[PDB]
Design a protein around this ligand. Structure first.
Ligand SMILES: [K+]
Ligand SMILES: [K+]
Ligand SMILES: [K+]
Ligand SMILES: [K+]
Ligand SMILES: [K+]
Ligand SMILES: [K+]
Ligand SMILES: [K+]
Ligand SMILES: [K+]
Ligand SMILES: [K+]
Ligand SMILES: [K+]
Ligand SMILES: [K+]
Ligand SMILES: [Mg+2]
Ligand SMILES: [Mg+2]
Ligand SMILES: [Mg+2]
Ligand SMILES: [Mg+2]
Ligand SMILES: [Mg+2]
Ligand SMILES: [Mg+2]
Ligand SMILES: [Mg+2]
Ligand SMILES: [Mg+2]
Ligand SMILES: [Mg+2]
Ligand SMILES: [Mg+2]
Ligand SMILES: [Mg+2]
Ligand SMILES: [Mg+2]
Ligand SMILES: [Mg+2]
Ligand SMILES: [Mg+2]
Ligand SMILES: [Mg+2]
Ligand SMILES: [Mg+2]
Ligand SMILES: [Mg+2]
Ligand SMILES: [Mg+2]
Ligand SMILES: [Mg+2]
Ligand SMILES: [Mg+2]
Ligand SMILES: [Mg+2]
Ligand SMILES: [Mg+2]
Ligand SMILES: [Mg+2]
Ligand SMILES: [Mg+2]
Ligand SMILES: [Mg+2]
Ligand SMILES: [Mg+2]
Ligand SMILES: [Mg+2]
Ligand SMILES: [Mg+2]
Lengths: 147, 261, 184
RNA sequence: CCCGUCGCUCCUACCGAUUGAAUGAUCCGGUGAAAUGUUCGGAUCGCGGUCGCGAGAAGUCCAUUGAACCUUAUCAUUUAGAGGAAGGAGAAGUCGUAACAAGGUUUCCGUAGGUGAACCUGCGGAAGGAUCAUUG
RNA sequence: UCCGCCGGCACCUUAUGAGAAAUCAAAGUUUUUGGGUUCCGGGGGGAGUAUGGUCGCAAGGCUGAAACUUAAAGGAAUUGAC
RNA sequence: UGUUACUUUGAAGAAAUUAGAGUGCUCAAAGCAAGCCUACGCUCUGUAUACAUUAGCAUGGGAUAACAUUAUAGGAU
RNA sequence: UACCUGGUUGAUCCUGCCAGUAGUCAUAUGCUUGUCUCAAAGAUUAAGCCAUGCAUGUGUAAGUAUGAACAAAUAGACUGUGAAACUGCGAAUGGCUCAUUAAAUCAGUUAUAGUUUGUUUGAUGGUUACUCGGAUAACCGUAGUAAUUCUAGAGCUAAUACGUGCACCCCGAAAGGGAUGCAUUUAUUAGAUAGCGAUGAUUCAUGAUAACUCGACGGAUCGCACGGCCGCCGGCGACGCAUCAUUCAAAUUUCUGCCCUAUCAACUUUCGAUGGUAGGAUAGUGGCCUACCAUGGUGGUGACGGGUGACGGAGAAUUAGGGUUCGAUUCCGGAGAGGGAGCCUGAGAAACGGCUA
C-alpha cells in the first residue's frame, strides 16, 4: 500500500474511523477521499480523485493552492522523488545587433503521483508557495512527447 | 530601514498635489486613515494650498485646533488627515461644504456643495463576509465597516451612506449600463457608461467605459466607482462632468477665451 | 544566534554565497523545547514578534485527548512514549513532540463508557441507555487494550509552541499500522 | 643603401641558489571570551499556620550561537637577490660585406648540422625569377 | 570528320563592371551598402619572445602576453640615376 | 480548442531630469507662477501632453517564420 | 553642421597610424577678474585617526504636588500657577557614507490561499464594590570614592506605576446539578443543491459540539458641566484593555534582465549538496535545522572560480541614425557605523549619538 514511511500517512481532516458511512457525502467527509479543483480551467485527473496515494503537496489532493504565474516547458529531469526539472526555452533580444539568442531556465517543480512524465514530455506548471529550497511550482498537466 | 518612515521628501510626494519642487525639502506625510497615502489629500494641502485660508504650516494647526473643520461630519484635528475621494469637508464658520472629486485631469477638486447634498456620501464596497457570531458585515474602500448589510449588496457595489444616521440609505449594483467614474490610473477623473466587463481567471478584470461623446477607454475594476444607476449620477459633478478634452480642443477654447475675455 | 536565513546556504548550482549583510532579528530561531514526560509541570512564557506570546512546555504529565469514534474528549495522564517516526532516540528520552505515539490512562474514558452505554470494559435513564446500546460497536483491538488500562494515542499539538500535549486515540488502520511497528 | 657578432653607457623586462622576505585572505585543526537555554544551587525578601507557600541573586552543570588567539596548508599581491641572459635607446667605435643590380654563389619557405659574425651546407618546396615562349 | 548537350583542368579577346593600382570573366552583380555559414586582421617593433597549460622520447608543436620602444613601416605605380 | 514568435490597440505603470503646452521673474539661465478688473472680489484661475528598451498582462490581425503532428487513424460524424 | 586638415616620396595613388580640431552637471592647476542672478563643494588616496562644542527629547481643562516654591486670598481634603520626580511616549525617522556585495543588491512585473504590523480610521466586546493591598521617586539626612547622570544605608508619601479583586448541550431523583463571556489547544461535525455567504481555486469565512489552559483579556482611571426625578437618574470629553476590518509597513517571494576573464571545464554532496517523509524552530513558507531515506542539482545557451580603482536604479556626457562612455553624491532601493560576534528593551532594532565580549 501507500504506507511506506515510518509514520502513518493520511489526509488531514479526513476521519477514517467513523461509525457512520461516507456514502452520499462530499469529498473529505464521511471518510471519503478529499480532492478539489484548482480552477483556471484545469481538469482534475482521474488518478487523483480515485487514487490512494498521499501527497500533501499535490495540487488536487494536497494542501497547496495554485496562484501566480502559469508556465509551460519540457521535462528535463525526472530522477528526483515527486520532483522534476522543467526546461523553459525562450529568445533573448540583443538590442545592439537587433537579433535574438536562445536562452533557457531550469525550473524545479513538484509532480504528484497522479501524473506520469518522461524526459521530453511537455508539462504545464502553476506557481505555489515554497515547497522546498528551490521548488515553487506544481505540475498541472502533462502531454506525452510525440502527441 | 529598521521600522516605519515618518518623512516624505517633496519630490516623492504624489504629483496631483501640485507642490512646487523648490518650496522645501519635505512634503506633508499623510497620516494613517480611511484612504491610502497616494490617493488622498491631506487637510494641510486643502486649507493652505487649495483654499488659501492658511498661509503657513503653523496657521493650519491653529484652524484645526479650534475645531473649525469637519470631515464626514466629524471634527478632525490632524493636519495630515487623509481626506480622499467622496469625502465631505465642512467648515461651519464659512458656511462652506466641499466634496473631494477628481477633475478631468486627475487632480482632486473641492466641489462646493449645497447644505442638503452635504448630508451623505458614496462608498465602494470592498467585500462582504461573516464576522464573529456569524453576523454578516461589509467593509468599504474608505475604511468603514457596516454590520447587517442588505443581503443583495455584493463586492464592488456602491452604497449611499448618510453622515447623520450612519446607515446605508441605498445601494447600486455593479453592472453594465451604469454611470461610473475612474478613480485611478491614466483615465482618472473621467466619467462614462460601463459598457463591458472582461473577466480573466487569476488576473485583473478589465472594464470598458464609453464617454458621453463616444470616446471609449478601458481600465481595471479596482479603479472604477459607480456614481448612479442608469445614466444619472447620484452626486453633483464638476463643470467638466468627466469629459476629457484633447489638447487641441483645450487649446481651441483658450484661444476663444482671449478673444472674448 | 540561531538563524533561518538562506545566506549561509549554497546556491542551487552549488556555488557559495558571499555575505552581504549581518544576521537580522526578524529571521532568528530559538532553542528546542525538548518537552519531557514528568509530574513536575513547567511551561515558560516566551515573548515573540509583535508582542505576542508562545508557551514552551519543558515538562508535562497530562493532556486533553479525544476519542474520535465516540466523539468524547477527556483530560488524561500521559504514561509513556512508545514510538516516534522521526528519531527513535526521542522514545527512550520520553520526549513529547507532535505526532509521537504515547500511552494514556484509560480510566477517564472507561467512566464515560459506563455512564454512556452502561457497560464495563432510574426508569427513564435505563430507557435511553438501552436505546444507545443498539448501535454500539467497539473495535476488538481497541477493547483489548482497555484491560491493561492504557490506550495508544497520537499527539496532535505542538508542546514547544502551545505548551500543551493534546491528541487523539488511535483506531482503525492507523492503530493497526503502529501496533505492528511495536510488535517485536 | 645596408645585415650581425664583439666593445662602451643608460633604460625596461625576464631567469635565478636563497627550504627568499613581507603583507592580506581563506580552509581544516586546537584553544576559547561573552551571551542565551537547561541543570543544580538557595544568599536574601515577602506572605500564612516554628513548620509551610511564593519570588529569587552569586555560583554551578550541559548545550547552542560564537568573537578572539595560535599552528600547518593553500591562494593573492608586492619585493630583495650573487650571477646568467633578452630587447630597446644612445650624430660621427671594431671586424667583415649577408641583402637591394644575375648584388657578383638568384632570393625565399620548412627542417637538420656547422662556423667570430653576418651566414654556409644537405633534403623537399615556392617565384615574391633573372624564363608567361620549341607542334622542335 | 561535322553538329550539339552535361561535367572538368585551363587559355584568349573585351568593359557595360571592379580595384590604390598591378590586375580580375571574378577579385563583377557594394554608400543604389543585407543569399547562408566558418576562420581570421586592427600602425611598426618588442614577438611567435616571457610565463602558465597541453602534446611529444627528443627536436619541437599547439595555446600565447606585458613592460618598453618608435613616426613611420608597408602596397601599387611614375621619372631619374645606377 | 496544438504550442510560439511577429504586428496592432489598450491597460498598468514614481517624482525629478529629457521633449513639450501656458505664463513679459525688466531679458535670460529659471521659476510655477499668474491674469482680470477695482470689490470686501472674480477667472470652477493654471500647475497640460508626449516619450518611457526588454520581460510580464489584455484585445484584433494570420502574411512571413519556428516547433509539434499525420496511414494497422485510439480519426471525424 | 550626417565636415575633416598636417606628416612616409624626387614626385604620384593607396593602406595605415601619429598629430591637430570640438565637447564633458570633469577633475586638478596656472595666470587674470568690475557688476547681476544662480550654485557644487574631504566622494576618488585613508569605511584612516579624532581635541572641543553641538546634533533628542517631551506637559494637556483631562495619570501622580504638602517643594519646608511663587502669587493672590482667607477653618478648610484637593480644585491659581508650578520646578523637581514617578508614570507614558519617542529616540528603529532623519542625517552620513559606498566598505562588503556580480542573479546577489537592484529594475519592471508577480504572489502571500505563507506571515507580523504601536498608531490612524470604522465597527464590535455576555444573562470592600459608596472603590482593595504593599512598595518607591522627588523630598529629607548619614555617607563612601581621586573620580563619572559612580554608588550604599535610614526616615516620609502618590498613581492610568506595581500586585490584587466585586465585575443551546450533558448528567439526572422533569426538580436539581454541570458546563455556559472572550481568547487559548485538540478532536468530531455542518459549511447543500442548482434556511444556507465568498473565491479562477481552499475540509475557506463562519456555526454547532466534547474538553482543555494554572489566560498580563472582560475600566478599582481623569477633565468640564450641572441638570432632571423623589436618595434615584443623567450630559459632553480624555485616557486605557480586547477582537475583526482598514491604513501606515515589513518580511519572504514569481518571471526576465548585469561589466572583463577559459592562461578558470567541470562544480556541488562525510560536516546539506538536490529531493522525499516525520518532527523541531520561526510572525510565517522553506534543508531554516534534526532523524531517517533516495542519488540527485548546475554546466560552451559559459556552471564553478578569478578580476573590478563594482553599491543598483531613476539617470549623466556626447549623440544624423545606430552607438560609446559614465552613474561615490541631494529621488527610490540596499548596506554599514573602527573589525567581528552576541543581546536587551520594544509594535518595530541583531540599534551602535543602546548594552555585552
Ligand atoms: K528593512
Ligand atoms: K646569399
Ligand atoms: K634575388
Ligand atoms: K658549409
Ligand atoms: K567543355
Ligand atoms: K520607542
Ligand atoms: K523587483
Ligand atoms: K541588475
Ligand atoms: K518556517
Ligand atoms: K524535508
Ligand atoms: K514602543
Ligand atoms: Mg535612515
Ligand atoms: Mg489574485
Ligand atoms: Mg653580397
Ligand atoms: Mg663573392
Ligand atoms: Mg648572393
Ligand atoms: Mg583579360
Ligand atoms: Mg557591406
Ligand atoms: Mg599591430
Ligand atoms: Mg559619425
Ligand atoms: Mg621629403
Ligand atoms: Mg587623438
Ligand atoms: Mg521619565
Ligand atoms: Mg566575481
Ligand atoms: Mg532572479
Ligand atoms: Mg474553518
Ligand atoms: Mg516541514
Ligand atoms: Mg540529516
Ligand atoms: Mg557601476
Ligand atoms: Mg567598492
Ligand atoms: Mg549611485
Ligand atoms: Mg569607491
Ligand atoms: Mg558628500
Ligand atoms: Mg539613499
Ligand atoms: Mg544597521
Ligand atoms: Mg573611522
Ligand atoms: Mg551593532
Ligand atoms: Mg556618532
Ligand atoms: Mg544612528
Amino acid at each position: 500500500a501507500e504506507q511506506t514511511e515510518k509514520a502513518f500517512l493520511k489526509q488531514p481532516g479526513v476521519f477514517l474511523s467513523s461509525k457512520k458511512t461516507g456514502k452520499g457525502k462530499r469529498p473529505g467527509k464521511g471518510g471519503n477521499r478529499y480532492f478539489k479543483s484548482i480552477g483556471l480551467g484545469f481538469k482534475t485527473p482521474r488518478e487523483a480523485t480515485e487514487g490512494t496515494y498521499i501527497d500533501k503537496k499535490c495540487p488536487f489532493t494536497g494542501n497547496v493552492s495554485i496562484r501566480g504565474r502559469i508556465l509551460a516547458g519540457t521535462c528535463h529531469s525526472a530522477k528526483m522523488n515527486r520532483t522534476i526539472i522543467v526546461r523553459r526555452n525562450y529568445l533573448h533580444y540583443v538590442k545592439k545587433y537587433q537579433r535574438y539568442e536562445k536562452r533557457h531556465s531550469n525550473i524545479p517543480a513538484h509532480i504528484s503521483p497522479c501524473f506520469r512524465v518522461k524526459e521530453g514530455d511537455h508539462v504545464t506548471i502553476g506557481q505555489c508557495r515554497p515547497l522546498s529550497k528551490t521548488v515553487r511550482f506544481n505540475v498541472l498537466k502533462v502531454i506525452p512527447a510525440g502527441s | 530601514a529598521r521600522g516605519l518612515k515618518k518623512h516624505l521628501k517633496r519630490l516623492n510626494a504624489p504629483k496631483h498635489w501640485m507642490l512646487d519642487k523648490l518650496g522645501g525639502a519635505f512634503a506633508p506625510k499623510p497620516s494613517s486613515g480611511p484612504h491610502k497615502s497616494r490617493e488622498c489629500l491631506p487637510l494641510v494641502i486643502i486649507l493652505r494650498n487649495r483654499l488659501k485660508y492658511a498661509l503657513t504650516y503653523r496657521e493650519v494647526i491653529s484652524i484645526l485646533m479650534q475645531r473649525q473643520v469637519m470631515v464626514d461630519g466629524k471634527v478632525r484635528t490632524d493636519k495630515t488627515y487623509p481626506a480622499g475621494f467622496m469625502d465631505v469637508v465642512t467648515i461651519p464658520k464659512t458656511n462652506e461644504s466641499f466634496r473631494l472629486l477628481y477633475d478631468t485631469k486627475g487632480r482632486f477638486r473641492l466641489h462646493s456643495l449645497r447644505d442638503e447634498e452635504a448630508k451623505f456620501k458614496l462608498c465602494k464596497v470592498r467585500s462582504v463576509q461573516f464576522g464573529q457570531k456569524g453576523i454578516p458585515y461589509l467593509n468599504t474602500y474608505d475604511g468603514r465597516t457596516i454590520r447587517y448589510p442588505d443581503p443583495l449588496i455584493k463586492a464592488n457595489d456602491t452604497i449611499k451612506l448618510d453622515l447623520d444616521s450612519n446607515k446605508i440609505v441605498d445601494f447600486i449594483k455593479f453592472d453594465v449600463g451604469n454611470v461610473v467614474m475612474v478613480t485611478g490610473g491614466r483615465n482618472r477623473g473621467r466619467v462614462g457608461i460601463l459598457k463591458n466587463r472582461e473577466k480573466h481567471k487569476g488576473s485583473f478584470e478589465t472594464v470598458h467605459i464609453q464617454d458621453s461623446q463616444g470616446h471609449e477607454f478601458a481600465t481595471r475594476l479596482g479603479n472604477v466607482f459607480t456614481l448612479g444607476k442608469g445614466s444619472k449620477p447620484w452626486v453633483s459633478l464638476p463643470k467638466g462632468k468627466g469629459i476629457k478634452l484633447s489638447i487641441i480642443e483645450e487649446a481651441r477654447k483658450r484661444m476663444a477665451a482671449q478673444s472674448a475675455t | 544566534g540561531i538563524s533561518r536565513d538562506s545566506m549561509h546556504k549554497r546556491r542551487a548550482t552549488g556555488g557559495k554565497k558571499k555575505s552581504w549583510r549581518k544576521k537580522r532579528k526578524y529571521e532568528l530561531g530559538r532553542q528546542p523545547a525538548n518537552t519531557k514526560i514528568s509530574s513536575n509541570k513547567t511551561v515558560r512564557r516566551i515573548r515573540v514578534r509583535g508582542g505576542n506570546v508562545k508557551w514552551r512546555a519543558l515538562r508535562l504529565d497530562t493532556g486533553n485527548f479525544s476519542w474520535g469514534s465516540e466523539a468524547v474528549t477527556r483530560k488524561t495522564r500521559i504514561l509513556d512514549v512508545v514510538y516516534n517516526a522521526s528519531n527513535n532516540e526521542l522514545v527512550r528520552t520520553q520526549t513529547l513532540v507532535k505526532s509521537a505515539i504515547v500511552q494514556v490512562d484509560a480510566a477517564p474514558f472507561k467512566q464515560w463508557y459506563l455512564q454512556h452505554y452502561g457497560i464495563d470494559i432510574s426508569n427513564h435513564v435505563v430507557r435511553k441507555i438501552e436505546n444507545r446500546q443498539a448501535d454500539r460497536k467497539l473495535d476488538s483491538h481497541l477493547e483489548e487494550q482497555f484491560a491493561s488500562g492504557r490506550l495508544l494515542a497520537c499527539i496532535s499539538s505542538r508542546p514547544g509552541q502551545c505548551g500543551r500535549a493534546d491528541g487523539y486515540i488511535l483506531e482503525g488502520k492507523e492503530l493497526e499500522f503502529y501496533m505492528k511497528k511495536l510488535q517485536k
